[PDB]
Design brief:
The structure is cut from a larger assembly and holds 2 copies of chain A, 1 copy of chain B, 2 copies of chain C and 2 copies of chain E.
Chain A: E1 5-9, H1 12-18, E2 19-22, E3 87-97, H2 99-103, H3 108-112, H4 117-124, E4 129-132, E5 144-145, H5 147-153, E6 162-164, H6 167-176, H7 179-192, H8 196-215, E7 223-229, E8 246-247, H9 250-269, H10 274-292, H11 312-316, H12 323-328, E9 335-341, E10 351-354, H13 355-361, H14 363-372, H15 379-388, H16 393-401, E11 406-410, E12 419-422, E13 424-427, E14 432-433, H17 439-442, E15 450-454, H18 459-467
Parallel strand pairs in A: 2-3, 9-14, 10-13
Antiparallel strand pairs in A: 3-7, 4-5, 4-6, 9-15, 11-12, 11-15
Helix pairs in contact in A: 7-8, 9-10, 14-15, 14-16
Chain B: H1 6-11, H2 17-30, H3 45-54, H4 60-76
Helix pairs in contact in B: 2-3
Chain E: H1 2-11
The chains are: A alpha/beta, B mainly alpha, C mainly alpha, E mainly alpha.
The structure holds magnesium ion and zinc ion.
Zinc ion binds near residues 55, 56, 59 and 75 of chain A.
The structure holds a DNA duplex.
Chain lengths: ~500, ~80, ~270, ~50, ~50, ~100, ~15
DNA sequence: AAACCTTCCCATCAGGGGAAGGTC
DNA sequence: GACCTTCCCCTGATGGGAAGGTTTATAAT
């Protein structure tokens, strides 16, 4: 399949490239027919069908109609799984800063333009204007002016002197500058005067902009013109028991973003005063920042719930984000657990396994072996046989268990001997029988401790269990040559 | 069953490539393209492959020569 | 109509009239801006009433601002009353209408929200009057609706519960983690389908190629779509009742004791 | 400080109040603006033809 | 899908429109029923056992 | 508790559902325990075929019942959801050369 | 682990 | 929250018509 | 027979209802 992965700043064109339609409403569903309202956070036209291979209206309803675009509802007919993949976008009226590049400890936007963070934040809040592209005037292309300064400033030069306020100003600052120019000069500056501060700001900024230019990402993309939206099935509105519905708070945040952006567009079309439109730009910035990463701002409260709302960065980062809880560690099929007992009669290379656990575990192999030996007509009949628990299937489980090792693990896994492979021995009861000599390797008392079992499915897994993770193959500790199978008490 | 694989680690150094070669052999066996080289005492393809390895009659090179011969046999099937 | 005409709208005199109209527009913008920027405090004081109705404070004050804008635009002073009373109703309308519109994860029509509020008022009225809480029918007759609308409106208005709400007695196991998937297909039925394909292939192997073709074609086996019997007739050059007939015998030969058993097990 | 509510609170607090000839003269200025805009377009042939 | 349609056409078996959700005893437990009770909405018609 | 193939979560394709199901969550420590051994395919089938691949689980079930022990792993679903969650931000994450 | 061999075949490729 | 007005998608009806049937 | 009366299929006619919009004037900071 594929090779190395790349990461970079998103061009608004690229954002629209991922995107198929623009969400223009804060609506989700119709509230009586729970069909998606087009075109909102949940939309069939933008994202896809609610049910597999069906239009929302139902005119092009048959499953043969693959790839056709409907014309009464504008829905493309495919599997509903694509309702979890396809993206959308929102066109922001006013530019908006990306809080990840603003509030990162070495502020990317701030450190990029050789500017302190407090001044940038004071500019984003419309507390003070800022110059851009002065040409030949008194001030340099970047400076801060209060409103009483901006009053009699433009009276000195109406043209050749551009001075805005807010996020548009930061975007104009990022677009006006082309970093080759500001790098060639830093060369001489960092060459002449020693001044440890000089070399420090030099190394940091010069490396930033040279590695910056090498890739090709443009500084203007730190300011968000278009906003990509998450697919709806990743933040679902699936109905719950009792008529109540369940949804991710993402929906609320995207809802606020859409609402405030549309209200800003309406205020622009209504010729609103500057105070109101500045307030609305600040509020839209607040909403976008709360969506991207909640916590570096006023920490928007939920709806009727006192806790904050899970944002996107809240979905990603943390010990419960998709990194620690999903990608590094994951729940596994073909697994079980139970309290453990002694089973001294066992030889070292085996463990006692309850009958019901081994039955529920090895179900697919049981079905396959039963239908291979002709004892079952089809797979449905095999499932019926095991659900009846007929007496013949126990010998089939004997057959499938003989040379098929299993993996045993205790909860406090410290070293690799915290997991060990054994040969299953069918046992009446509901407790796992673990060889006593291995208890020292497990630190497993018989004071109520529970252990888990896993089944190696593929041939490679079975051979890795028999040749590497086998209890017999692991007798000497890895930390020290001392044996780990030493008799205990 | 096979309690210790130590002998298979002896005949093929690098006790990992033993796993890979034996998985290749057990894939040749389970997927019914081939048959065992040692009597099957009702062992699955895993222990059968390992017993083949212990007797020093199956490793990477023997299986690879067999595959390179089957390639030319299928080339002779061009007729 | 004047706004429509000015939107639809010697060069020196024409641009002088346009400059007069544009000075009027800019001066009216400055005057309305003075009025709105001065009554912003009234907007804030009004919005301080609808705080916890499901929308943010600043959202309320901004909707009241849009209100006040239309209010100063539609006001006429010759009526003489204190125009603060005139802007009051306008700000109230803007705020309440916006709360009804956009403060819901599931947007509901505004009249529905007003009916819900009326029902809540009735329940407050008859709370201590009927002892426990008044019976699920009498508050319906208190209303004007066909009186079974009560259970409908009560079934709706369930606000969607947050998915990240921590499940009871534990943090941070969350409710969204316990929502299973019913749209996906389970492995057993999928494997039975992949086996049914081969079973039907084997059973159709027995019939004659024309019987196999007409059976595969009347249905959609190993093809794209099903076909009308007339379409099968058009394709074969034998047509329509032959088609209806062959099917029967075909099914009969698969309904006969042998070759049927396996399919029966599915 | 950085809280969106206060940045608006103070900014709206700066502007002055409305008593009372302020309101009346603002209304008169709106009327004079629309009066200049009605003296203009008082001789628009498309408006005279639409009337 | 087509194969199921052919099967139903050969064997003439009505595919019920209703899905099964009946409360059944959980896996691995067994016992005796000691008490059943039922809660029914306002006046909307009873079950017979209700 | 025991489970071979049960229900799966909707937000991310993971087995916990309902009675407790799903394996004893194969945490990072157990991943390290597998990494210390020379067992690589065990870990792969652990976090790809058995757990997160919506395609892989069924395409593996079919091969298991067919008597062929293989795996067409593909990409785990949590990583795809994370790709979408990153691309939801102003961050362009792509998949490079073949 | 095992994959190293496989991976050694790819990184060299 | 209420009174009055407008619009849009829609679940049924007057009316037409094309023949169709029955009779002094 | 000719004309008089009758019974089902489409035209759309328009009545129904739900959703949406615009005002509401003692003052209300
Ligand atoms: Mg203990
Ligand atoms: Zn459609």
């Amino acid at each position: 399949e594929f090779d190395a992965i790349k990461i970079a700043l998103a061009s608004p064109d690229m954002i629209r490239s991922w995107s198929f339609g623009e969400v223009k409403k804060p609506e989700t569903i119709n509230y009586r027919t729970f069909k998606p309202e087009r075109d909102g956070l949940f939309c069939a036209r933008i994202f896809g069908p609610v049910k597999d291979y069906e239009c929302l209206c139902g005119k092009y309803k048959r499953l043969k109609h693959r790839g056709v675009i409907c014309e009464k509802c504008g829905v493309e007919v495919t599997q509903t799984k694509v309702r979890r993949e396809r993206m959308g976008h929102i066109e922001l009226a006013s530019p908006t800063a990306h809080i990840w590049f603003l509030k990162s400890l070495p502020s990317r936007i701030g450190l990029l333009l050789d500017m302190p963070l407090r001044d940038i934040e004071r500019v984003l809040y419309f507390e003070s204007y800022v110059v851009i592209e002065g040409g030949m005037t008194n001030l340099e292309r970047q400076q801060i002016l209060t409103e009483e300064q901006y009053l009699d400033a433009l009276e000195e030069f109406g043209d050749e002197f551009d001075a805005k306020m807010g996020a548009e100003a930061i975007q104009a600052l990022l677009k006006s500058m082309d970093l080759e120019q500001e790098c060639e000069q830093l060369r001489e500056e960092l060459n002449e005067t020693n001044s440890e501060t000089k070399r420090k700001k030099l190394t940091k900024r010069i490396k930033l902009l040279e590695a910056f230019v090498q890739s090709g990402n443009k500084p203007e993309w730190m300011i968000l013109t278009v906003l990509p939206v998450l697919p709806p099935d990743l933040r679902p509105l699936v109905p719950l028991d009792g008529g109540r519905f369940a949804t991710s708070d993402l929906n609320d945040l995207y809802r606020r973003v859409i609402n405030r952006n549309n209200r800003l567009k309406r205020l622009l079309d209504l010729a609103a005063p500057d105070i109101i439109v500045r307030n609305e730009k600040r509020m839209l910035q607040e909403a976008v920042d709360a969506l991207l990463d909640n916590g570096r701002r006023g920490r928007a409260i939920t709806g009727s719930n006192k806790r904050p709302l899970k944002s996107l960065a809240d979905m990603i980062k943390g010990k419960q984000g998709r990194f620690r809880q999903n990608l590094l560690g994951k729940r596994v099929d073909y697994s079980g657990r139970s309290v453990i007992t002694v089973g001294p009669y066992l030889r070292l290379h085996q463990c006692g396994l309850p009958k019901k656990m081994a039955l529920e575990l090895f179900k697919p192999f049981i079905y396959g072996k039963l239908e291979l030996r002709g004892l079952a007509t089809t797979i449905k009949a095999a499932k019926k046989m095991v659900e009846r628990e007929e007496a013949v299937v126990w010998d089939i489980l004997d057959e499938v268990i003989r040379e098929h090792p299993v993996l045993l693990n205790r909860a406090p896994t410290l070293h690799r001997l915290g997991i060990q492979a054994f040969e299953p021995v069918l046992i009446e009861g509901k407790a796992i029988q673990l060889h006593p000599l291995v208890c020292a390797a497990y630190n497993a008392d018989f004071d109520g401790d529970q252990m888990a079992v896993h089944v190696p499915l593929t041939l490679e897994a079975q051979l890795e269990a028999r040749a590497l993770m086998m209890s017999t193959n692991n007798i000497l500790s890895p930390a020290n040559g001392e044996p780990i199978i030493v008799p205990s008490q | 069953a096979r309690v210790t694989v130590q002998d298979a680690v002896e005949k093929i150094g690098n006790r990992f490539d033993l796993v890979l070669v034996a998985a290749r052999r057990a894939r040749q066996m389970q997927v019914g393209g081939k048959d065992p080289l040692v009597p099957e005492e009702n062992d699955k393809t895993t222990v059968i492959a390992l017993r083949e390895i212990e007797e020093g009659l199956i490793n990477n090179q023997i299986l690879d020569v067999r595959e390179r011969q089957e390639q030319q046999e299928q080339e002779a099937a061009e007729l | 109509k004047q706004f429509d005409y000015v939107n639809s709208m010697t060069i020196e005199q024409v641009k002088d009239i346009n400059r007069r109209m544009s000075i009027g527009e800019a001066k009216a913008r400055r005057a309305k801006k003075e009025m709105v920027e001065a009554n912003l405090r009234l907007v804030i004081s009004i919005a301080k009433k609808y705080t916890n109705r499901g929308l943010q404070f600043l959202d309320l004050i901004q909707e009241g601002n849009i209100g006040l804008m239309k209010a100063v635009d539609k006001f006429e002073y010759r009526r003489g009353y204190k125009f603060s009373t005139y802007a009051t109703w306008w700000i109230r309308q803007a705020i309440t209408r916006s709360i009804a519109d956009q403060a819901r994860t599931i947007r509901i029509p505004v009249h529905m929200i007003e009916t819900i509020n009326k029902l809540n008022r009735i329940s407050r009225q008859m709370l201590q009057e009927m002892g426990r809480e008044p019976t699920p029918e009498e508050l319906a007759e208190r209303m004007l609706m066909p009186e079974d609308k009560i259970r409908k409106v009560l079934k709706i208005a369930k606000e969607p519960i947050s998915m990240e709400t921590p499940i009871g007695d534990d943090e941070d196991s969350h409710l969204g983690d316990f929502i299973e998937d019913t749209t996906l297909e389970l492995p057993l039925d999928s494997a039975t389908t992949e086996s049914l394909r081969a079973a039907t292939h084997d059973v159709l192997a027995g019939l004659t190629a024309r019987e196999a073709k007409v059976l595969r074609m009347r249905f959609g086996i190993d093809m794209n779509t099903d076909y009308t019997l007339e379409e099968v007739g058009k394709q074969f050059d034998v047509t329509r009742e032959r088609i209806r007939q062959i099917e029967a015998k075909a099914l009969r030969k698969l309904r006969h004791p042998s070759r049927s058993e396996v399919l029966r097990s599915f | 400080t950085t809280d969106p509510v206060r940045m608006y609170m103070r900014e709206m607090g700066t502007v002055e109040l409305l008593t009372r000839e302020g309101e009346i003269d603002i209304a008169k200025r709106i009327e004079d603006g629309i009066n200049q805009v009605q003296c203009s377009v008082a001789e628009y042939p498309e408006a005279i033809t639409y009337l | 899908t087509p194969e199921e349609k052919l099967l139903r056409a050969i064997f003439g078996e009505k595919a019920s429109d209703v899905k099964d959700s009946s409360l059944r005893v959980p896996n691995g437990v067994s016992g005796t029923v000691i008490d059943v009770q039922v809660f029914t909405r306002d006046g909307v018609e009873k079950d017979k056992r209700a | 508790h025991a489970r071979s193939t049960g229900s799966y979560s909707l937000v991310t394709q993971q087995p916990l559902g309902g009675a407790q199901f799903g394996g004893q969550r194969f945490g990072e420590m157990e991943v390290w325990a597998l990494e210390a051994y020379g067992a690589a395919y065990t870990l792969q089938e652990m976090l790809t075929v058995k757990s997160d691949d919506v395609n892989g689980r069924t395409k593996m079930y079919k091969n298991i019942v067919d008597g062929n022990h293989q795996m067409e792993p593909g990409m785990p679903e949590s990583f795809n959801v994370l790709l979408k969650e990153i691309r939801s931000l102003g961050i362009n994450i792509e998949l490079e050369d073949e | 682990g095992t994959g190293y061999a496989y991976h050694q075949d790819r990184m060299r490729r």
